[PDB]
Amino acid sequence: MKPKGMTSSQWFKIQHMQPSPQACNSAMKNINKHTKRCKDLNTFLHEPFSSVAATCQTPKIACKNGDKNCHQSHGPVSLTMCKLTSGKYPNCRYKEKRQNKSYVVACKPPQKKDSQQFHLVPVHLDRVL
């Protein structure tokens, strides 16, 4: 039923964590196994989910059309935009591009893995600014 061992922000930290995923090539490899396909593009952020968690506390914005569940960093964060360099789905290699911009990540209540309890863990990534 509901995930396990991979809280919402946890699944998104293996899919969008730059603190030290081991090269987008490998960071994306964990996604090709959970997606059985290489999304072709994957972005990551370089800030501890505890700091990104608090970063996701600044004013939000009507995500869909009034969801108000996104949160843009109050400044430029050393993020990393990885892209699929080439190879295919079972042999796709990515390149990590270290960029610095204020992005927008969405948040949700700590499922069950809750690294601590946050109450708005950094789950999705609305966009990069």
Tokens (6 digits) for 36: 């059985």
Out of 71, 74, 119, 124, which one is annotated catalytic? 124
- Judge whether 124 counts as a catalytic residue: yes
43 annotated to a ligand binding site:
yes
127 annotated to a ligand binding site:
yes
Nearest CA to 125 out of 21, 43, 47 is that of 43
Out of 16, 46, 74, 119, which one is annotated catalytic? 16
Q: Give CA–CA dist 44/93, Å, rounded.
A: 15
Nearest CA to 85 out of 24, 6, 4 is that of 24
42 annotated to a ligand binding site:
yes
- Judge whether 34 counts as a catalytic residue: no
Q: Give CA–CA dist 67/120, Å, rounded.
A: 14
Q: With contact defined as beta carbons under 8 Å apart, do 41 and 113 qualify? A: no
37 annotated to a ligand binding site:
no
7 annotated to a ligand binding site:
no
Residue list, annotated binding site: 16, 39, 42-43, 124, 127
Q: Among all residues, which ones are annotated catalytic?
A: 16, 124
Residues annotated in a binding site for dUMP: 16, 39, 42-43, 124, 127
